[PDB]
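Blackboard transcription, Thursday session:
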Amino acid sequence: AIAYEVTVNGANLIGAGMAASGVGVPAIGVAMCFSSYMLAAARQPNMSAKLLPYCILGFALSEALALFTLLIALLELFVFS
Amino acid sequence: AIAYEVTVNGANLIGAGMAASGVGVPAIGVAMCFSSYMLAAARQPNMSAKLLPYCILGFALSEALALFTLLIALLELFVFS
Amino acid sequence: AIAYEVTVNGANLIGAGMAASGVGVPAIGVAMCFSSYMLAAARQPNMSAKLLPYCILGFALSEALALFTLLIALLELFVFS
Amino acid sequence: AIAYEVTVNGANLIGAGMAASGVGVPAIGVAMCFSSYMLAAARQPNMSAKLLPYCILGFALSEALALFTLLIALLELFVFS
Amino acid sequence: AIAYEVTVNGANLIGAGMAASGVGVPAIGVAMCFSSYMLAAARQPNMSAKLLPYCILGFALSEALALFTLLIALLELFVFS
Amino acid sequence: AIAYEVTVNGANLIGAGMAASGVGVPAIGVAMCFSSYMLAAARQPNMSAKLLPYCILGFALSEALALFTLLIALLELFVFS
Amino acid sequence: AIAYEVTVNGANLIGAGMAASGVGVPAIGVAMCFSSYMLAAARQPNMSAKLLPYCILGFALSEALALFTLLIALLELFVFS
Amino acid sequence: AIAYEVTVNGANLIGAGMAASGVGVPAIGVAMCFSSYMLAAARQPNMSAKLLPYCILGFALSEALALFTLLIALLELFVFS
Amino acid sequence: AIAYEVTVNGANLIGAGMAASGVGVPAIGVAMCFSSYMLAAARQPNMSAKLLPYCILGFALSEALALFTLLIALLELFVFS
Amino acid sequence: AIAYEVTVNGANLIGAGMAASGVGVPAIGVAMCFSSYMLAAARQPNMSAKLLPYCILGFALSEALALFTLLIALLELFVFS
Amino acid sequence: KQEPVAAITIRTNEGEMGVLAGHEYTVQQLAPGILEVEYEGGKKDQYVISGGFAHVNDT
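(Written on the board underneath:)
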């Protein structure tokens, strides 16, 4: 059989879109973490002080997932040909 | 094996829409935060002032992912040939 | 290696739909905001006047995200070749 | 390197379907408006008249996002070659 | 540069499925309306008469988008080459 | 520019898998209606008779969209070449 | 213009995966029905039997859509060349 | 007109991933069943024996489609060339 | 008619992402079981021991579906040429 | 029949985005694990210590599927040619 | 006995709730704790309770 290697330079960018579709997904998980702190504080204000660590932790992890996806999108272009 | 480099200029634009679909994904989390503040206000009006700092915060960071997700597609075009 | 450059004019019009797919996702954020305002006001009508700004804010922002997506689709065609 | 302009006329009609996929998403929010107004109207019949404008407004704005997507689908064909 | 025009005839039938995928996406938001009517009628059966105008309205125009999404794929084929 | 018509016969079938992907998304809407009927009757037992008329209507017309979504994929193959 | 018909035999299979993605979407519709039955029965054990016909009916004509979709994916291969 | 049959062997392994995307769509439905069993028994522990059949029954069905969704991709490779 | 077999080695990888995309869909089902166990024990602490078996079981089943989806992606590369 | 083997090097990077899209989906589950634990603590402060084990369990183990969903895209580029 | 009051905050098994004029008609158990009452003059008055039921009319 015959053998044609091809190097498509446009495909340097298409992937950046698909990762970019997943950068907004954890944003849902952002509000879901703060919302739970709102109502849980509305239901029990005195407990609001010690539920904050859990809230910031959840928001930070969800944001970390978003950040890694975004990092793929930005790392996909400025180094790859 | 023979080597064909190809440069697809059309792919400069396709990815623009692909991140654009990810710009609306945070928009549902927006009301996920604001609804939390609303129902928490009806839960306790007196706490309305103390939950606001996590409303305006809980939106903007969700908006931040909507910006970077939106940034790429706008950065994707006016610089890339 | 050998260098073949292609300019796909058809890609002018594919991505217009790709952004257009995401224009509808913020509509759920819209209705989520209003649903929260309705159940909250029905829970406490006195607070309705106080929650209206937040609603108008949390709505608009959601709508804005859709608009940006839409803008791409409209900026994708009548200027690009 | 060599330069090939290609015009894919068949791509005049592939992008309409992606927008068309976006036209039905806002319905998730459309009923989400009425679904609130019902429950609200149940929990307080007297306020059913005062929450009515808000419901109409939210429905209309969700539907406007849907409409813009649909407009792309119709505009994608009857003017483009 | 050289000018290759292509007319892909099979694509006329690819977009039929593409809009078809969005014909059922409203259906969750179609049954959401009747779902709300059931829970609301259980909440206050005497209000059941006052709510069904705001049900059918939210029903048909939630169904309507599917038609607007369906019509495309049916308009996509029997006229286009 | 030279005119290369192409008639892709494989494209007769790929689209069939697209509409088929949308035949499932009504099913969640289907079970939403009966779930509403269950929780409504468990909320008000004697109302169970007067809610069923508004339960079958959401059942068929939610199923109906699936039929049309299912129709295209079956209408896409056994008539088209 | 010159007419190049093509018959892509790989397209016999790609579509089969697409419908397969839709075979799972009814599965989330199954547990909606049974979860409703559980919470309705714990809400009212005396209505456990009267709501069982709808508990079964929600699964049959929901899984049926999964079967129609799966039927496409398996009908797509063992007859088409 | 002219006729070029092409046999794309790569499509053997593309569709395998395409079904794999749907194998997890049941899992979110799987946990819905047991979540219901938990909270339903939390409302009435004495009923936990009567609801458990419908709980076990709810899994194997929801899981079954996953297998069928998973079947194709495993049916797609170890037989097709 | 003429006959061109093509063996695209790149298709060894394009599916791996798609199978990879569905590995995170069950994670919502993962937390759907633990969230339920949390709120269930929050309504009846004494029953926490009797609901733990179901909780572990559901986490395991959702995780198994995720694992199969992941297995396709890892099996798609290290054996296929 | 003739046989053209092709090696598409661009496909090395397309899939990088494709897995990346599924990296943010688990976030909705991840925050769910915390979004439960808050409300449960708001439902029962004294049981907050006994629910915490199953609050970091699902946290890290849903994040584990996120890790393997991301590890493909990072394993897709710096080893493959 | 039917005193005019601007707002009132109650403790429940579900949690803590707030009540204003025209609050939604709702009834639920009171969990054994404290209660806060705010009169129109900005003052406040707090009462320890032992369970009970609170009924809020739409009027």
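Lecturer's comment: Chains K and I do not touch (no CB pair under 8 Å).
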